[PDB]
Amino acid sequence: LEEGSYVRIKRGIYKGDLAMVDQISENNLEVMLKIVPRLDYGKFDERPTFAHRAPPQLFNPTMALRLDQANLYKRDDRHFTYKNEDYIDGYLYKSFRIQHVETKNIQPTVEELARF
Numbered sequence: 001l002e003e004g005s006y007v008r009i010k011r012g013i014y015k016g017d018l019a020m021v022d023q024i025s026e027n028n029l030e031v032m033l034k035i036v037p038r039l040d041y042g043k044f045d046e047r048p049t050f051a052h053r054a055p056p057q058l059f060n061p062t063m064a065l066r067l068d069q070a071n072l073y074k075r076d077d078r079h080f081t082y083k084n085e086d087y088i089d090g091y092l093y094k095s096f097r098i099q100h101v102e103t104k105n106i107q108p109t110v111e112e113l114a115r116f
Contacts, residue, residue: 001031006108006116007101013038013053014094018112019101022093031101035092036115042068042083058090 009017019033038054061080064072073081078089086093
């Protein structure tokens with residue numbers, strides 16, 4: 001597990017998705033991951049599940065501004081907090097337990113070769 005390398009997420013709506021390791025935590029049990037988000041911009045709001053997850057697409061802050069500005073906070077250059085998650089230059093940065101990522105024998109998919 002090294003910063004800058006790829007892992008596959010094992011839990012949640014991002015289960016199965018490829019992610020870059022951004023930062024290994026001080027407590028040595030977590031890892032901040034850079035992830036292509038799966039968002040709806042609050043479209044049908046009044047717990048998401050893996051089975052019903054959205055398609056992956058980079059975060060679009062102007063789309064968030066247009067559709068759900070109440071939940072959008074600018075934090076820095078290219079950094080927004082949207083619905084209490086952080087997006088920097090379009091990617092989600094989210095902490096996962098190291099035990100919830102796969103670091104070994106990852107096989108990039110056709111789709112991942114096209115993207116990354």
